[PDB]
Amino acid sequence: EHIPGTLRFRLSPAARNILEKHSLDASQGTATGPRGIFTKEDALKLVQLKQTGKILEHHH
């Protein structure tokens, strides 16, 4: 879908702030904004996935 190595230029500033705050890897997400931009909502899906890992570990 995208040219390799372009994710760091397609990250929105909102996403980049959320990924850094939570020490997340954007390459585990998908870019769903127009023309391949990785949006705030795309980074929040990675926050929800990290929370899911912690919640399941706690129930295990």
CA 36 to chain centre: 13
Helix 40-59 with 13-21: angle, nearest 10 deg: 20
- How were these coordinates obtained? X-ray
**Maximum pairwise Cα distance, the chain:** 40
Per domain, the residue ranges of the chain are: 1-60
Residue type at 24? L
Q: Give DSSP secondary structure letters for 23-60.
A: T--GGGS---SGGG-B-HHHHHHHHHHHHHHHHHHHH-
Q: In CATH, what number does 1-60 get? A: 4.10.320.10
DSSP state of 2: -
> Cα separation of 8 and 24, whole Å?
13
**Residues constituting the chain:** 60
> Cα separation of 18 and 24, whole Å?
8
∠ CA 53-56-60, rounded to 5°: 135
Task: Retrieve residue 20's tokens.
Answer: 């850094």
Resolution for the entry shown, Å = 1.5
